[PDB]
Amino acid sequence: GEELFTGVVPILVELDGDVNGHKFSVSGEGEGDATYGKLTLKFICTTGKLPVPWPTLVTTLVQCFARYPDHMKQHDFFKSAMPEGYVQERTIFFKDDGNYKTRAEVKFEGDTLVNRIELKGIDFKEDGNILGHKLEYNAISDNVYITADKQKNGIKANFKIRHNIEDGSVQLADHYQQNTPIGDGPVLLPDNHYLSTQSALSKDPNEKRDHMVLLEFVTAAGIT
C-alpha cells in the first residue's frame, strides 16, 4: 500500500455537482509525491462557469498523498487501503448558509490515483457568500483532526476552514468526514493525529476556461 506511493503518482479527479439545482462538473489532473507530501493539480469546470467559489471545492477535490513521518507510518490509514481504495464522505456546513454532502471513491486505476466525487449542496442563500461569489480566491490552510472509527473499520475526521470574504470577514466551513475501505483487507487504524495542510491557489494565465491551479502540501503530525 505504502509502496505504491514512494515515487511521483499521476492523479485524476472527476466531480459531478449539484448545488441548489445548479449542476456542474469538474475534472482535474496532476501528480502527487507523498515522500514530500506534495500535490500539483489543475482543475477545469467542464460545464462552463462554476456556480460556487473554487475555494469551497478544494477540500472535496486525496489524503493518501500525506507525508507520514517515519515514526508515524503505522497510523496512515489512507495508503493502507490501497490499491483497492476507500470511500471518503463529508458534510460541510457553511455557517449561516447551506451545506455540501460529498461522497467519493479514491482508488488506483492502473498507475493512476483516481478521485471520483459526487457533491450535493442544499439550503444555500441566493445572495449569500457561496452562490453570490463573495469569497476571495485565497489559499486555505488548517489541520485535519483524525480519529479511528473501529465500527466502520476506518477513520473519522473533523476540521474548520475559514474562507476569507471580500469585505474582510470570514465564512466558516465546518467539515465532518468519514473514510471506509473499499476492500476487505487489513487497514491501519490510527491513534489520534492531524494532517497539517496548506493549499495555494492560482490561475493559468493561458487558460480561458473556468479553472483552478493548486500547489498543496500535506504532512501528518501530532504524535511524538
Author numbering: 4 to 64, 68 to 230
List sentences quoted exactly from the publication behind this structure.
Indeed, two types of radiation damage could be defined: (i) global damage, which is mainly observed in reciprocal space and corresponds to a degradation of the diffraction properties of a crystal, and (ii) specific damage, which is mainly observed in real space and corresponds to the photoreduction of metal centres, the photoreduction of photoactive protein chromophores, the breakage of covalent bonds (for example disulfide bridges) and/or the loss of electron density for the side chains of some amino acids. Here, a series of MX experiments are described which suggest that specific and global radiation damage are much less decoupled at room temperature than they are at cryogenic temperatures. In addition to Cerulean, two other systems were studied: lysozyme, in order to examine the photoreduction of disulfide bonds at RT, and the photoadduct of the LOV2 domain of phototropin 2 from Arabidopsis thaliana, which upon light activation forms a covalent bond between the protein and its cofactor that is particularly sensitive to specific radiation damage at cryogenic temperatures. In other words, and in contrast to the situation at cryogenic temperature, specific and global radiation damage evolve on similar dose scales at room temperature for these three systems, all of which involve covalent-bond breakage.
Fluorescent proteins of the green fluorescent protein family are β-barrel-shaped proteins that contain a fluorescent chromophore formed by the autocatalytic cyclization of three consecutive amino-acid residues and, as such, they provide convenient genetically encoded fluorescent reporters of localization or interaction in cellulo. The sensitivity of fluorescent proteins to specific X-ray-induced radiation damage at cryogenic temperature has been well documented, showing that the conserved glutamate residue close to the chromophore (Glu222 according to the GFP sequence) appears to be specifically affected at relatively low absorbed doses [i.e. ∼0.1, 0.8 and 0.1 MGy for IrisFP, EGFP and mNeonGreen, respectively]. Given the sensitivity of this residue in fluorescent proteins to specific radiation damage, the cyan fluorescent protein Cerulean, which produces well diffracting crystals, was chosen as the first target in the work described here. Cerulean possesses a radiosensitive glutamate residue next to the chromophore, the side chain of which is severely affected by specific radiation damage (decarboxylation) during cryo-MX experiments. To evaluate the characteristic dose at which specific radiation damage occurs at 100 K in crystals of Cerulean, we analysed the evolution of the atomic B factors of the progressively radiolysed carboxylate group of Glu222.
